[PDB]
């Protein structure tokens, strides 16, 4: 939601001038003011570094919830600063180990389908049937039918 | 000199077009390399799991053979003791 | 489980260390007892290369190691390596600190005293167990069969020993210990394979020859007929794929390797086979318990797993024994772990709970306590 | 498939896990106080005899001896556990390093930057040669 | 080494840990006050001992996790 | 005029280099296309055969269970016979 | 990070010197290693004519020079020229004084000792580096692939060597070094071009023949079929424009030049091709690590960049090897700089930071320190 608006609120005119200079090529005239997202694929390459194209499509779709295909300077700003690294310190590695210890309430050293399933159910979050399997792929990186330390560690890596 | 300037500008626009084609090819190259790396990793995993399955099948087959033969012998002996 | 305290039934053996908590059906962790230092130089930096891989880890990196067993024939010849093996067994394969668990080692009959005393001294000083007890490897195998009489032939991998027991009273003057076992059969197989062209020399390739022996060899019911058949037809030649390809074909080496058990003259040993040392062990017993020993002959140990040995041995003993007695050979399917199952049963008994060698007793009499009343 | 909902689930479960850690810590503190009161009974000795005072002091000295023995044993065990933890941490760090350190490097930082430096030097070569006349 | 070394080490720790032992030869009021003080000392020692027990439990589970992680390589 | 001609020669060499880039890019891309297709086909086949082996192994499990039960029966019969 | 400095990962090679700071992806400066004195008289005064053009400068004035490589086959035959090349590399292509930077040279296996000792003596006395270390050119190429096992065939321009490695333990008895490489292929191509009329003789025209080889030649999947096809159709004849016009047409010389790698009898060498020295190098290894070496065959070096070699080599080895093993040939697209990328990775490691040959150590033991523990 507006969380990434708050995250982008750090960068004031200091980078806004550069962003407007980059976006000037986007607004090349001969338009009705709609200002689509067509150029963004190469606009994110104005400096050279580019994240995965699937992430680019996700960035295109997730903002502009009206589907207007109109890129406001605020949404363009937040999507382009997302190219720069933005992580909220990702908890603490020892804190992450403590969180995993809480997760492994079965004291087995591993989390299976039912364990994490019930853990997420306790939150009451609406979970689809197309889900659960998605989380299985997210966790069972080794495809060994359980969640090991490394699978959780990369699973939650850099997330806060 | 005028003719040469004409040719100079024409080659100039041609050179810009060349640079753009070069960058496009470069991006395509990075992309295809990524794809190949992914698929090859999948190949590794597929081959390894195949091998595991084949080995387990072999072991179970052998054990079945041994136990079956022992059972047959003991059946013959049961008749004998009858 | 929970409160209370469970015993550790370790079983050193020679070739496979079998361990697990008392009261179960099968050992928890079974792994070869080999410690192999690397022998080449090593050029990658930071690879995390250790100085000695023990247990089952050294059966996967055996291509660049020099595996060496720390137990030759029952006795222990290299105490540092044996200590390393025990440390691995306690901490990594069971993950239970020894400070809170009694231990029940096993020892072959007629072994040197110093071996047993050093074993108890190590267990009490280094690992610092609460109490340990040493038991003869054949009485346990008799426990596992649920009998109380019978003469047990425990042909392990280090040493083959034959302890007769009646009504719970062991006969110490009738124990016949013979040093032919699985390891000598592996060496003899490796020596007769050279007659076809396959040469195995490295200490790592001894493991490959052991695998060949386990998977292919069998004991012939009648030796001369098999030698004649294998020399005319080709129905016996079974092939086997080495760890790199180049399949090999074993001909009459199949039943000639384990035949050494019944004719120890093949490897130059003087003594009589396992078919005749059992009869001699019986004949040393009293005249009134020979029928029961004849009827309750028990097989145990790994090497008695050859396909077709329970019939060859019965035929041989029936040839030797008087015609009236009935000869029966007990060959349970769980032969390999019979000693450990018996050890678990013995450690789980309530009557046995006061026979452990408590640590305060060791502190008062020294390591020589093991030969005393607490046997 | 969804991708933002994955992050939403991660955030919600991480907050839930922090709440579980906090409540487990509170339960641990409560149970700590409960067991402390269980093992350490309170006593009051108003208007007591000197002999009973000596008996209580000797019993307290024996309690001191046993508690110090137990704290020594648990301290030695925990220190050995800490050494083992450090060893395992070092070994796992060595494994992770040997797995992943070769994979981190500065990719194409200056290789892309080579646009016309050689070309510029070549052109300036002819320019400098002609500068003589 | 754990036959004479560890026993002497723990005996030395026991001997050094003991403070002065001369109390009851004094006036009753301060005697009772110091008895209450030592009762509080015993309470704090027992509480810390329980804390160390819980820390040992956590570290044992962590060591099991580390053993699992090192085993997972093969 | 001479300066312009020099410029033209520079543009010519740069155009040459650009076409060179184009050719090498195409060649490498076709190569990776070949590798991609071969890897994909082999991955498909390997997964198929591995799953086949898994099915056969499960069948072997069931067979072994049957044989074990029957051996238990024959053993009981033999011991009672004794 | 913090204090301290960066290491110079130089890589002498033979044909192209590749250098750059440790921790990057590609070498900073890559230029041929040739030193060419002028050979004509010279009449213009004050033109600023130097006495020796080295590096990439002598590939532009090669029309009036006599280029001569200072490294023949791995070994260095002309020490003054090599010193000149190093001085150029440090001062003009990187512009970093060597007084403040460790260096990591590379050396082929099985090279003469005196070469290595002279190399370290030069680096410590003339350039006066803080610390230098010499590494075998194949271990680095194994680093760059991110593996830890595998048998690497590093077919450079001077010498082709084939070092097998398992689990980080190099096998010194299985290194097969063969002296056929890119330079001999250039000479053979220059020799077979004369069959159409094109004669290249001057040492400057060897560079033109090298360019022809790089741009046109390819390795045939099957040699006889290609020889038959090129002799009937004309779909193979590719043309190429010399540095002055007069285009030339290469027929079946295209795949006959690099075929010398798999049949060294073409240039009169006795030994077997690079397809059979790899199999021989594998077969000298132990019987239990042959599967891993079969599955992780690594290619490196410049000369392994011929279009279609990763398939010909796999076909040949699959023909030689047992039918069960899987043969896989790792051919990364960054083959040419694989050794240098591996060198950068090795120099960037923290565990390696104490293996450098510090200058005080050299002062105490002389140049023979390199053969000692600091290898």
Swiss-Prot record, chain A:
Free-text function comment from the UniProt entry: Troponin is the central regulatory protein of striated muscle contraction. Tn consists of three components: Tn-I which is the inhibitor of actomyosin ATPase, Tn-T which contains the binding site for tropomyosin and Tn-C. The binding of calcium to Tn-C abolishes the inhibitory action of Tn on actin filaments.
Gene Ontology, cellular component aspect: cardiac Troponin complex
BP-aspect Gene Ontology terms: cardiac muscle contraction; regulation of muscle filament sliding speed; skeletal muscle contraction; transition between fast and slow fiber; ventricular cardiac muscle tissue morphogenesis
Gene name, Swiss-Prot/TrEMBL: TNNC1
Binding site for Ca(2+) 1: 64, 66, 68, 70, 75
Family membership noted in the UniProt record: Belongs to the troponin C family.
The entry's keywords: Acetylation, Calcium, Metal-binding, Muscle protein, Phosphoprotein, Repeat
Molecular function as annotated in GO: actin filament binding; calcium ion binding; calcium-dependent protein binding; protein homodimerization activity; troponin I binding; troponin T binding
Occurrences of domain EF-hand (ranges): 15-50, 51-86, 91-126, 127-160
Binding site for Ca(2+) 3: 140, 142, 144, 146, 151
Protein name: Troponin C, slow skeletal and cardiac muscles
Swiss-Prot record, chains B, F:
Induction: Induced by hypoxia. This induction is reversed by exposure to normal levels of oxygen.
Chain positions found as Phosphoserine: 41, 53, 73
Subcellular location: Cytoplasm, Cytoskeleton
Function: Binds to actin filaments in muscle and non-muscle cells. Plays a central role, in association with the troponin complex, in the calcium dependent regulation of vertebrate striated muscle contraction. Smooth muscle contraction is regulated by interaction with caldesmon. In non-muscle cells is implicated in stabilizing cytoskeleton actin filaments.
Family, similarity comment: Belongs to the tropomyosin family.
Subunit structure: Homodimer. Heterodimer of an alpha (TPM1, TPM3 or TPM4) and a beta (TPM2) chain. Interacts with HRG (via the HRR domain); the interaction contributes to the antiangiogenic properties of the histidine/proline-rich region (HRR) of HRG. Interacts (via N-terminus) with LMOD2 (via N-terminus) and TMOD1 (via N-terminus).
Entry comment, domain topic: The molecule is in a coiled coil structure that is formed by 2 polypeptide chains. The sequence exhibits a prominent seven-residues periodicity.
Protein name: Tropomyosin alpha-1 chain
Species: Sus scrofa (Pig)
Gene behind the chain: TPM1
Shown stretch of the complete protein: 134 to 215 of 284
């Amino acid at each position: 939601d507006d969380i990434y608006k708050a995250a982008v609120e750090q960068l004031t005119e200091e980078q806004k001038n550069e962003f407007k200079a980059a976006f000037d090529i986007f607004v090349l005239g001969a338009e009705d003011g709609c200002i689509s997202t067509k150029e963004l694929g190469k606009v994110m390459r104005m400096l050279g570094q580019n994240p995965t194209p699937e992430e680019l499509q996700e960035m295109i779709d997730e903002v502009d919830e009206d589907g207007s295909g109109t890129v406001d300077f605020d949404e363009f700003l937040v999507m382009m600063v997302r190219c720069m690294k933005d992580d909220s310190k990702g908890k603490s590695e020892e804190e992450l180990s403590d969180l995993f210890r809480m997760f492994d309430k079965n004291a087995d050293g591993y989390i299976d389908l039912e364990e994490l399933k019930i853990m997420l159910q306790a939150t009451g979050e609406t979970i689809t049937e197309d889900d659960i399997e998605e989380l299985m792929k997210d966790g069972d990186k080794n495809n060994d039918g359980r969640i090991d330390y490394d699978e959780f560690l990369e699973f939650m890596k850099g997330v806060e | 000199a005028q003719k040469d300037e004409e040719k100079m500008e024409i080659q100039e626009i041609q050179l810009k077009e060349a640079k753009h084609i070069a960058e496009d090819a470069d991006r395509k190259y990075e992309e295809v390399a990524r794809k190949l790396v992914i698929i090859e990793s999948d190949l590794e995993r597929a081959e390894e799991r195949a091998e595991l399955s084949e080995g387990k099948c072999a072991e179970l087959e052998e054990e079945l053979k041994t136990v079956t033969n022992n059972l047959k012998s003991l059946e013959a002996q049961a008749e004998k003791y009858s | 489980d929970d409160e209370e305290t469970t015993a550790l039934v370790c079983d050193n053996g020679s070739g496979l260390v079998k361990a697990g908590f008392a009261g179960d059906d099968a050992p928890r962790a079974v792994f070869p007892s080999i410690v192999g230092r690397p022998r080449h130089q090593g050029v990658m930096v930071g690879m995390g290369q250790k100085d000695s891989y023990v247990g089952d880890e050294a059966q996967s990196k055996r291509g660049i190691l020099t595996l060496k067993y720390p137990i030759e024939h029952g006795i222990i010849t290299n105490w540092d390596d044996m200590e390393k093996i025990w440390h691995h067994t306690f901490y990594n394969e069971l993950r239970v600190a020894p400070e809170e668990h009694p231990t029940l080692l096993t020892e072959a009959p007629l072994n040197p005293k110093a071996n047993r005393e050093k074993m108890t001294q190590i267990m009490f000083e280094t690992f610092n167990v609460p109490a340990m007890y040493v038991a003869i490897q054949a009485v346990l195998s008799l426990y596992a069969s649920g009998r109380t009489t019978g003469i047990v032939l425990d042909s392990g991998d280090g040493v083959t020993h034959n302890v007769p027991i009646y009504e719970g009273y062991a006969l110490p003057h009738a124990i016949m210990r013979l040093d032919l076992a699985g390891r000598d059969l592996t060496d003899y197989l490796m020596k007769i394979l050279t007659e076809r062209g396959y040469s195995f020399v490295t200490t790592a390739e001894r493991e490959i020859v052991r695998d060949i022996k386990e998977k292919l060899c069998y004991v012939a019911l009648d030796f001369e007929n098999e030698m004649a058949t294998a020399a005319s037809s080709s129905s016996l030649e079974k092939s086997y794929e080495l760890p790199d390809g180049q399949v090999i074909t074993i001909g009459n080496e199949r039943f000639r390797c384990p035949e050494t058990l019944f004719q120890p003259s093949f490897i130059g040993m003087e003594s009589a086979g396992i078919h005749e040392t059992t009869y001699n062990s019986i004949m040393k017993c009293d005249i009134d318990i020979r029928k029961d020993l004849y009827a309750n002959n028990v097989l145990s140990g790994g090497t008695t797993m050859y396909p077709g040995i329970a019939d060859r041995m019965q035929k041989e003993i029936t040839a030797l024994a008087p015609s009236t007695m009935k000869i029966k050979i007990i060959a349970p399917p769980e032969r390999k772990y019979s000693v450990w199952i018996g050890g678990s049963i013995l450690a789980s008994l309530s009557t046995f709970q006061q026979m452990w060698i408590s640590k305060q007793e060791y502190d008062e009499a020294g390591p020589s306590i093991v030969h005393r009343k607490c046997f | 498939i969804s991708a933002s909902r994955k992050l939403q689930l991660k955030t919600l479960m991480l907050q839930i896990a922090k709440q579980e850690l906090e409540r487990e810590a509170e339960e641990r503190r409560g149970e700590k106080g409960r067991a402390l009161s269980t093992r350490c009974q309170p006593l009051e000795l108003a208007g007591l005899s000197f002999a009973e005072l000596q008996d209580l002091c000797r019993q307290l000295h024996a309690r001191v001896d046993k508690v110090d023995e137990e704290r020594y044993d648990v301290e030695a065990k925990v220190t050995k556990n800490i050494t083992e933890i450090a060893d395992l941490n070092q070994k796992i760090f060595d494994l992770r390093g040997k797995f992943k350190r070769p994979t981190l490097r500065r990719v194409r930082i200056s290789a892309d930057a080579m646009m016309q430096a050689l070309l510029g030097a070549r052109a300036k070569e002819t320019l400098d040669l002609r500068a003589h006349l | 080494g754990k036959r004479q070394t560890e026993r002497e080490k723990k005996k030395k720790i026991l001997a050094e840990r003991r403070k002065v032992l001369a109390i009851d030869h004094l006036n009753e009021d301060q005697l009772r006050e110091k008895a209450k003080e030592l009762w509080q000392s015993i309470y704090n020692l027992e509480a810390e001992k329980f804390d160390l027990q819980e820390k040992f439990k956590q570290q044992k589970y962590e060591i099991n996790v580390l053993r699992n992680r090192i085993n997972d390589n093969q």
